[PDB]
């Protein structure tokens, strides 16, 4: 009774394929380097004195 009305059919499919080219036409992941340089400088402070 629970299976009354059950019909099962296959609709479609998906297929995995990889394009192994021996010459290849992809650009991968580009690798670079950049330089960030900082400037740190040191001032004076108010004076102290005894008279």
């Amino acid at each position: 009774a629970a299976l009354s009305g059950l019909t099962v059919t296959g609709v479609g499919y998906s297929l995995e394929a990889r394009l192994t080219n021996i010459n290849q036409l992809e650009m991968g992941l580009l690798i670079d380097s950049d330089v960030q340089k900082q400037g740190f400088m040191i001032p004076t402070l108010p004076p102290l004195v005894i008279v």
């Binding site: 080219n21 021996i22 010459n23 036409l25």
Partner: protein
Amino acid sequence: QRIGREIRLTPRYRYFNFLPIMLVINVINLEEAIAQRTALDVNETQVTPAS
């Protein structure tokens, strides 16, 4: 944007024609004549008065 090795031939020639003389013969029904009995077409000189 592909990589491959190729081998090429460069053909160079020409056929010229000088002599304006030549003959051709056509052969037909060669097999049938030897396949079947053939003999002796007579020019029967029709002496049975009709000519």
